[PDB]
Amino acid sequence: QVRLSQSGGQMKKPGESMRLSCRASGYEFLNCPINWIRLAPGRRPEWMGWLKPRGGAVNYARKFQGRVTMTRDVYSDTAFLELRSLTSDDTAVYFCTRGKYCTARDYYNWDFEHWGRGAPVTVSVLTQSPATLSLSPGETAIISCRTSQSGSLAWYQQRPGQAPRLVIYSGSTRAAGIPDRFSGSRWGADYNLSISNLESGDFGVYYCQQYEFFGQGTKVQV
Amino acid sequence: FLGFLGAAGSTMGAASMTLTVQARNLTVWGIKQLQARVLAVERYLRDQQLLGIWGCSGKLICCTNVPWNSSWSNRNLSEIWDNMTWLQWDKEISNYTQIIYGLLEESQNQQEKNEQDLLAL
Amino acid sequence: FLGFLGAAGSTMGAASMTLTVQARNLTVWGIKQLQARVLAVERYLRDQQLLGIWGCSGKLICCTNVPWNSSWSNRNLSEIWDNMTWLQWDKEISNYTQIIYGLLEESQNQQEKNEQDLLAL
Amino acid sequence: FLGFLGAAGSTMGAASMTLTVQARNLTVWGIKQLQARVLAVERYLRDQQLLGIWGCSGKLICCTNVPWNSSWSNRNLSEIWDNMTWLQWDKEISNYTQIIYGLLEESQNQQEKNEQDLLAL
Amino acid sequence: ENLWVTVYYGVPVWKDAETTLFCASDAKAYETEKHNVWATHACVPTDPNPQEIHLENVTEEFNMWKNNMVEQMHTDIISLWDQSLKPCVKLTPLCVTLQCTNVTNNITDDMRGELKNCSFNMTTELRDKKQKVYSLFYRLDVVQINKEYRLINCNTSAITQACPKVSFEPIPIHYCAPAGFAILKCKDKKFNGTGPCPSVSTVQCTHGIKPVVSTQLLLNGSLAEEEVMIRSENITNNAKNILVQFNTPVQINCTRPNNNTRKSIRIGPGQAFYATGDIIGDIRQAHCNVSKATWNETLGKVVKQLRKHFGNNTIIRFANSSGGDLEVTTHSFNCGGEFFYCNTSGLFNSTWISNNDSITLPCRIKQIINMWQRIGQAMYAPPIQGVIRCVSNITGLILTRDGGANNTSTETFRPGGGDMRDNWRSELYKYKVVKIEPLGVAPTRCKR
Amino acid sequence: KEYRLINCNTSAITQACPKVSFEPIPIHYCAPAGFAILKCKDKKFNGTGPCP
Amino acid sequence: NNITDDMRGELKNCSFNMTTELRDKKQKVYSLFYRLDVVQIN
Ligand SMILES: *[C@@H]1O[C@H](CO)[C@@H](O[C@@H]2O[C@H](CO)[C@@H](O[C@@H]3O[C@H](CO[C@H]4O[C@H](CO[C@H]5O[C@H](CO)[C@@H](O)[C@H](O)[C@@H]5O[C@H]5O[C@H](CO)[C@@H](O)[C@H](O)[C@@H]5O)[C@@H](O)[C@H](O[C@H]5O[C@H](CO)[C@@H](O)[C@H](O)[C@@H]5O[C@H]5O[C@H](CO)[C@@H](O)[C@H](O)[C@@H]5O)[C@@H]4O)[C@@H](O)[C@H](O[C@H]4O[C@H](CO)[C@@H](O)[C@H](O)[C@@H]4O[C@H]4O[C@H](CO)[C@@H](O)[C@H](O)[C@@H]4O[C@H]4O[C@H](CO)[C@@H](O)[C@H](O)[C@@H]4O)[C@@H]3O)[C@H](O)[C@H]2NC(C)=O)[C@H](O)[C@H]1NC(C)=O
Ligand SMILES: *[C@@H]1O[C@H](CO)[C@@H](O[C@@H]2O[C@H](CO)[C@@H](O[C@@H]3O[C@H](CO[C@H]4O[C@H](CO[C@H]5O[C@H](CO)[C@@H](O)[C@H](O)[C@@H]5O[C@H]5O[C@H](CO)[C@@H](O)[C@H](O)[C@@H]5O)[C@@H](O)[C@H](O[C@H]5O[C@H](CO)[C@@H](O)[C@H](O)[C@@H]5O[C@H]5O[C@H](CO)[C@@H](O)[C@H](O)[C@@H]5O)[C@@H]4O)[C@@H](O)[C@H](O[C@H]4O[C@H](CO)[C@@H](O)[C@H](O)[C@@H]4O[C@H]4O[C@H](CO)[C@@H](O)[C@H](O)[C@@H]4O[C@H]4O[C@H](CO)[C@@H](O)[C@H](O)[C@@H]4O)[C@@H]3O)[C@H](O)[C@H]2NC(C)=O)[C@H](O)[C@H]1NC(C)=O
Ligand SMILES: *[C@@H]1O[C@H](CO)[C@@H](O[C@@H]2O[C@H](CO)[C@@H](O[C@@H]3O[C@H](CO[C@H]4O[C@H](CO)[C@@H](O)[C@H](O)[C@@H]4O)[C@@H](O)[C@H](O[C@H]4O[C@H](CO)[C@@H](O)[C@H](O)[C@@H]4O)[C@@H]3O)[C@H](O)[C@H]2NC(C)=O)[C@H](O)[C@H]1NC(C)=O
Ligand SMILES: *[C@@H]1O[C@H](CO)[C@@H](O[C@@H]2O[C@H](CO)[C@@H](O[C@@H]3O[C@H](CO[C@H]4O[C@H](CO)[C@@H](O)[C@H](O)[C@@H]4O)[C@@H](O)[C@H](O[C@H]4O[C@H](CO)[C@@H](O)[C@H](O)[C@@H]4O)[C@@H]3O)[C@H](O)[C@H]2NC(C)=O)[C@H](O)[C@H]1NC(C)=O
Ligand SMILES: *[C@@H]1O[C@H](CO)[C@@H](O[C@@H]2O[C@H](CO)[C@@H](O[C@@H]3O[C@H](CO[C@H]4O[C@H](CO)[C@@H](O)[C@H](O)[C@@H]4O)[C@@H](O)[C@H](O[C@H]4O[C@H](CO)[C@@H](O)[C@H](O)[C@@H]4O)[C@@H]3O)[C@H](O)[C@H]2NC(C)=O)[C@H](O)[C@H]1NC(C)=O
Ligand SMILES: *[C@@H]1O[C@H](CO)[C@@H](O[C@@H]2O[C@H](CO)[C@@H](O[C@@H]3O[C@H](CO)[C@@H](O)[C@H](O[C@H]4O[C@H](CO)[C@@H](O)[C@H](O)[C@@H]4O)[C@@H]3O)[C@H](O)[C@H]2NC(C)=O)[C@H](O)[C@H]1NC(C)=O
Ligand SMILES: *[C@@H]1O[C@H](CO)[C@@H](O[C@@H]2O[C@H](CO)[C@@H](O[C@@H]3O[C@H](CO)[C@@H](O)[C@H](O[C@H]4O[C@H](CO)[C@@H](O)[C@H](O)[C@@H]4O)[C@@H]3O)[C@H](O)[C@H]2NC(C)=O)[C@H](O)[C@H]1NC(C)=O
Ligand SMILES: *[C@@H]1O[C@H](CO)[C@@H](O[C@@H]2O[C@H](CO)[C@@H](O)[C@H](O)[C@H]2NC(C)=O)[C@H](O)[C@H]1NC(C)=O
Ligand SMILES: *[C@@H]1O[C@H](CO)[C@@H](O)[C@H](O)[C@H]1NC(C)=O
Ligand SMILES: *[C@@H]1O[C@H](CO)[C@@H](O)[C@H](O)[C@H]1NC(C)=O
Ligand SMILES: *[C@@H]1O[C@H](CO)[C@@H](O)[C@H](O)[C@H]1NC(C)=O
Ligand SMILES: *[C@@H]1O[C@H](CO)[C@@H](O)[C@H](O)[C@H]1NC(C)=O
Ligand SMILES: *[C@@H]1O[C@H](CO)[C@@H](O)[C@H](O)[C@H]1NC(C)=O
């Protein structure tokens, strides 16, 4: 089975540098790229960059260029990350992710079916609505996301204190282990995630995604 | 002549004017071609065996005593040979190809030549 | 239908009811299948070549102008097709198979089509 | 009979008496025979494919509706079949072999069977 | 009035499929001595007269990103690289301690050595006697431990020397399909690489495709027809590489100033190692020149095409490679047998807003390589006598786009192309494999 | 006096197995289907040209 | 272990020289082998 094993979290001071590792197992390392994404509480998710295990090729975000360094060890199947000149803005939970579709022929990076456990680090478009959603068990939750670019969109669920799980990809297709209760729909630039017959496990925070861009998030609580 | 696959975009009737042209041509790294040219004659004889078991054997064209079922895309005589390409045609009848094959090979030359068996005894 | 080799234990006349069904289907360790599937089509074309040189070419069944010699297990018409299997039959005529083959391939289509050669000159 | 290629030095008419006999037989170092016996059946089916596309399919002999051009070594009927060998003959017509082939495969069974297509519509 | 079924054999009916393609090369490729230049020897000679048939009225959908010819060509060259190195000299007893020093020069200290004069023990023809011989190696080829050095590949894999008889020079290669199959070719002026094609033609063998191994720059590539072409599986996806095809070729000149000496030390009994001897002349570094004018116009023609997908009024910036393995970050290629790695910080140093000399680039040389991310196989490129000069065509790029933009609405592009399958997609975008199914039934008023 | 193997600056060396034998065996060379081998049966065929 | 002597060892803790990545340096490493895998001489 595909498993991403991350190193634990840490507390750093401003000005210092930080490093994280992520050991992949359960698949051929060279097949598909690994991504690094930071999650800050009550903030839009930020994609930092990806690394191809192939020739160690990488592509970062504008924001991090010159500060961030991604490498890998093909032999131990381990991906490494470094970020310099740490400032309070850097504080967030850092994840390593892998797309769902990843064969020898080709891949699709941005359907993140696999997530590491995450590393909490403290140093000291897509319009999603509604912000919050207070509903009772049994009711139906309708989360919306407006795009402007179009392209395979995904839905994720985050439980309190757990790593986000892929719920839906391509706007209408369910992931593995996802019951019929979750369903996706699309009309123009608008995207809707519908969860029927709410239960304890469903509650948390949900994110819409189009490639490296994420929504502001929708917290669904009991 | 328009060469190999010449009248592919032409109607099936016009594509019947170019039937013979497409049947005519049809240490490692050296095994790359051997394993392929073996599958080539196997793909050929698979077609020739099917062509033999039916009321054909003689290639190109042949008649059969099988009635065209209307459920198999009910089109007219003039609506097929003068308003449709073979590529467009095979796409519709693709669903019923395996069915028709069974009626040509079994119902026909197994019962048709058996007629002669009753005449030979 | 009774599938491949269905009427093997049936009489030759009844086994004539299922002739088309048996002709239809008919790094190392990967070469194991290659050397085999080559002999398969060679065994096929050995049979089709013999079927072609004779007064047949057209598969399944065909007539020939060769009189049945009584020494080849003199049986009656109703004693063969309604009281004997192909397996049991081939076992008796096995002795004369190589002989009959020579009379079909040489005496017939070499002299029969040559009739047309004298008519063609 | 005179065996394989028996009447090679005999006249073409006399060599027509022995047509069936020559069509009948027709870790490394073990691949030496495999790569060869693959080319053998490709050489066979190339000849049978040409024999099929023409007005023949049925082997040995067949008629065609193609007029003999006088430029192709204008000989008489009795000056060919009774005064010339196949080896001596093929040497003269070798120049026009590729030409005649085009007239048999294209001009004939592409237009001849198409006649029936106009009769089938 | 009632129709009857009729079997037709030899109908223009094909379906998309995958088969085993074989090779084809021109006669002059065999005629040139070559000795060994890839496995081209077993290859079938190319048909002297080209055969092509324009399919009128036919519209077929192509997909360069779902093409199997790329995957087959990739594994073919990979297996070829192994077969070319199997009967070659294996350098197992070359992992001896290297007592190295700087080369004979007069250096301030900013030259950082680069070249090392290593002395070491070696096995001769006889078992009993050691051999104290010296050689010359690049800094990228050696690594010091705990001055004593060692080969860089010692905790990676084993090593085998490329034979001096063989050559890595690209040869035009034609890929063909067996009987029962055919290859379709798009002949459009502006086919951006996916979807339906208006003017489709059929071929048995593709045009001469030289398997040039390169990254970032499509060195010895091929041209486009009208406007420069941009192909991407997903343009909105910045994780997918963007293959660029030029209309006008960019003339570039790459040279190796260091005229070298081959030293043929005998490991024995019949096996001989080739070591770089002393340099004769001056110590200079390899470099590549790009006509500034040609490059300025070419970049300016590309940026005008990029706007057509990222907004008419936007800013396009070019920045160097972000990081990674030395081969991907630099322009990787082969020339005259040696493997260069050039600094492309002088080509992607631009900023395009609202739409007389050569550009020289610092080039390094490695003899120990491990391309295709090969495991268990390291090849040592033997030294080459004489100054190496090569003149080639830059006809394409492999760019990558930075993500998490959102706000600025601007795009920055950096050179990539780590995977080598993209190098083949730049030539196989127009070709695809189909199988012929000549058996088609059709109804008509025909009974027996 | 110190010596060495004569093949040391020529090539490597491999020992012939004691199981194998180099004794000549009668070998018949044959052609596959579609081909044939011609044989001259003349008393005095000096090796080139036409054969009666 | 703590053995009376009826256990007959069975498992052996062997130490030996070994060739490293480099030609020059020997390697003094130890392993574990079954008695059925080894045989003493003299
Ligand atoms: C190269 O080459 C290549 C090839 O070869 C190419 O490619 C290309 O690309 C492009 C780009 O990328 C593309 O385009 C795109 O497309 C897409 C698709 O298309 C298709 O489809 C359509 C529809 O859609 C839908 O449906 C389908 C099915 O049917 C599906 O599949 C899809 O997905 C979708 O779905 C959805 O929806 C539905 C409903 O509707 C639902 O149900 C679901 O669920 C989902 O949701 C169609 O339509 C089309 O067709 C068309 O077109 C044609 C031509 O072409 C024609 O003929 C036809 O007829 C049609 O038309 C129509 O329509 C139109 C519209 O569209 C109109 O206008 C008119 O009038 C008519 O009516 C096809 O088939 C699409 O989607 C897109 O679109 C979009 O986008 C654009 C931009 O990009 C824009 O402009 C537009 O407008 C649109 O937008 C819109 O929408 C969106 C959504 O989608 C949103 O977001 C936005 O916002 C907007 O909204 C609006 O609208 C809506 C609707 O109406 C409404 O509701 C609202 O309210 C608003 O108003 C695009 O277009 C293409 O495709 C391709 N191609 C291929 C072949 O592939 C390229 O291009 C080249 N290159 C160069 C350079 O050249
Ligand atoms: C084994 O086996 C094998 C096989 O199998 C064999 O082989 C053989 O060998 C041999 C030896 O080696 C040989 O022989 C030789 O031959 C040669 C050739 O022949 C041929 O030819 C001829 C002619 O010649 C020419 O021509 C051609 C074409 O046509 C060419 O190719 C050549 O090269 C030449 O050319 C030249 O010349 C021309 C003019 O003529 C010019 O134009 C050019 O340019 C150049 O220069 C012919 O003729 C022949 O034929 C013949 O023969 C036959 C039989 O055989 C007959 O049938 C015929 O008919 C003929 O005859 C005729 O002729 C004769 C003469 O010849 C006369 O006599 C008579 O009568 C008639 O007319 C062929 O085809 C040759 O050449 C040679 O000859 C020579 O030599 C010899 C010695 O060796 C001598 O004897 C002779 O006589 C001669 O001599 C001469 O000549 C020379 C030159 O050549 C000179 O040098 C000298 O000096 C002399 O002179 C003279 O003459 C001249 C002329 O006439 C005059 O002019 C002057 O003045 C003088 O007088 C030889 O013979 C062969 O061939 C082979 N074969 C095969 C098949 O290959 C072997 O033998 C075996 N072995 C055993 C042991 O057995
Ligand atoms: C690619 O696809 C295009 C369009 O789909 C094809 O073009 C059509 O071709 C067909 C023939 O297959 C055409 O049909 C024939 O048109 C002939 C020409 O028309 C004449 O008269 C008009 C009016 O005066 C003028 O344009 C001009 O003077 C022409 O000379 C007619 O003569 C034909 O009628 C005769 O032939 C038929 C048999 O086909 C007989 O049964 C009739 O009795 C009569 O004697 C016929 O109508 C058609 O017009 C074309 N255009 C279309 C459909 O728009 C290409 O042929 C095709 N190419 C390939 C390679 O597939
Ligand atoms: C395996 O082997 C067994 C035994 O060897 C075979 O069984 C024999 O099958 C044959 C058919 O091939 C039988 O012969 C036929 O029997 C029919 C049934 O008999 C009817 O009447 C009797 C008496 O009332 C009842 O048992 C019952 O009502 C039956 O309905 C007859 O109807 C047949 O006669 C008709 O058909 C023939 C053509 O076959 C015509 O020419 C006649 O004019 C007539 O219309 C016929 O007699 C035989 O009886 C079976 N038993 C034996 C030989 O002991 C299996 O068939 C065989 N299976 C396989 C798969 O090989
Ligand atoms: C190798 O090459 C040689 C020479 O080229 C060939 O020998 C020639 O063979 C042909 C037959 O193909 C011979 O032609 C025939 O000769 C027969 C014998 O002649 C009889 O009469 C004469 C005179 O009395 C005597 O020699 C003797 O009594 C013979 O009995 C004729 O009988 C033939 O005529 C009859 O047959 C023809 C059909 O061929 C009928 O149309 C006639 O009406 C008639 O009934 C005929 O003439 C020829 O004579 C031979 N010698 C030559 C040409 O010089 C070899 O046959 C050849 N061998 C091989 C294996 O290819
Ligand atoms: C061998 O290598 C040594 C390196 O140690 C080298 O000696 C060096 O020469 C350079 C100049 O070539 C010296 O750098 C000088 O530094 C002083 C300041 O301390 C500057 O004023 C000098 O500037 C002048 O020279 C420049 C050179 O072109 C001019 O461009 C400029 O306009 C001025 O005229 C100059 O930068 C350096 O100090 C020495 N170093 C030592 C240790 O002597 C030597 O020349 C090399 N010889 C050979 C044969 O290769
Ligand atoms: C390490 O291994 C040593 C082996 O030398 C072991 O010490 C041995 O213990 C056994 C018992 O466990 C002793 O055997 C005894 O022999 C006397 C006669 O001399 C018997 O009377 C004893 O019988 C009693 O114990 C039995 C064992 O359970 C009972 O079943 C029985 O009912 C009696 O109560 C017993 O058989 C042996 O003499 C010693 N040997 C030495 C050298 O001391 C030691 O226990 C092991 N320790 C560990 C931690 O493994
Ligand atoms: C690369 O080298 C080629 C030749 O090796 C250069 O082409 C030459 O250009 C000069 C003009 O400066 C002409 O006089 C020569 O005749 C040309 N040579 C040939 C063979 O055509 C080219 O200019 C060089 N370009 C760069 C960027 O270095
Ligand atoms: C990306 O490409 C795939 C297939 O190449 C296509 O299905 C998909 O629609 C594309 N996405 C966008 C946003 O164009
Ligand atoms: C024709 O197809 C229909 C299904 O649409 C089927 O019910 C019918 O039996 C077919 N006709 C024959 C003669 O089998
Ligand atoms: C063939 O069957 C499939 C489903 O089995 C159907 O979607 C398709 O429309 C059918 N083809 C035609 C021409 O109706
Ligand atoms: C029939 O067989 C006998 C052998 O028992 C044989 O003598 C006889 O010649 C054969 N009949 C014919 C026409 O050959
Ligand atoms: C016969 O051959 C001549 C060449 O000598 C050629 O001109 C003529 O057209 C040919 N006959 C036919 C019917 O083509």
Numbering used by the authors:
A (entry chain I): 1 to 52, 52A, 53 to 82, 82A, 82B, 82C, 83 to 99, 99A, ...
B (entry chain C), C (entry chain B), D (entry chain K): 519 to 544, 569 to 663
E (entry chain A): 32 to 141, 150 to 185, 189 to 309, 312 to 321, 321A, 322 to 398, 411 to 503
F (entry chain J): 189 to 240
G (entry chain G): 136 to 141, 150 to 185
Task: Share the article's original sentences.
To further delineate the full extent of the VRC01-class epitope and paratope, we determined the crystal structure (at 4.4 Å) of a partially deglycosylated BG505 SOSIP trimer in complex with PGT122 Fab and the single-chain variable fragment (scFv) of NIH45-46. The trimer backbone conformation was very similar to the same trimer crystallized either with PGT122 alone (Cα RMSD 0.97 Å for gp120) or in the unliganded state (Cα RMSD 0.74 Å for gp120), illustrating that NIH45-46 binds to the "ground-state" conformation of Env and does not induce Env conformational changes. Glycans account for at least 30% of the surface area buried by NIH45-46 on the trimer; the antibody interacts with N197, N234, N276 and N462 glycans on one gp120 protomer and with the N262 glycan on the adjacent gp120 protomer. The N276 glycan appears to be truncated in the trimer structure, as there is no density for glycan moieties beyond the first NAG, which would be consistent with trimming by EndoH that was employed for deglycosylation of the protein used for structural study. In the absence of the N276 glycan, the N234 glycan appears to have avoided trimming and makes extensive contacts to the NIH45-46 L-FW3 patch, effectively replacing the N276 glycan interactions with L-FW3 seen in the eOD+VRC01 complex. This indicates promiscuity in the ability of the L-FW3 to interact with glycans, and also a level of redundancy in antibody recognition of the HIV Env glycan shield. Based on our trimer structure, we estimate that NIH45-46 buries ~25% more area on the Env trimer than on core gp120, nearly half of which is due to additional protein contacts. Importantly, NIH45-46 recognizes the bridging sheet in its pre-fusion conformation on the BG505 SOSIP trimer, positioning the H-FW3 patch to interact with gp120 elements β21, β3 and the base of the V2 loop. Moreover, the N197 glycan, at the V2 base on the trimer, is in H-bonding distance to two affinity-matured NIH45-46 residues, namely ArgH19 (H-FW1) and ArgH82A (H-FW3).
